Amino acid sequence: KPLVGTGMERAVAVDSGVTAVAKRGGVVQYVDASRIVIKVNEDEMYPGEAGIDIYNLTKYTRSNQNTCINQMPCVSLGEPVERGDVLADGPSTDLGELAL
């Protein structure tokens, strides 16, 4: 992460697909370095089919330029995430910020 930044880093991190961003706000049921399960809050949740948004993480894999592109979970077990929150960092992105 930049000790010294300008502020777009948060904007870039998300809008670039690299990071894994919460579809709907709720709480974390499960955290594995592999996947993340979100129990949606009632407000956002559609009536039927109920439950949860499940985000499957990308693990160690080849980039176009032969760099390594790997996602990591940045939230902790049973933590509140609001809609549009950073659920996991990509490569060269930290805590929602862009870290090249």
Partner: protein, 50 residues
Amino acid sequence: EIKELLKLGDLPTSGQIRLYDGRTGEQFERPVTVGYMYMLKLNHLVDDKM
């Protein structure tokens, strides 16, 4: 604002400090700047070029 934030750190405004050579152990005449600069590694890595 930069200096003002250097106060609160309890650090000089110079942005410079005195430093000492690790070898001879003796002081460096003049203050030198030290600080934290975000720095990148570009992928023109040597063992791809050689």
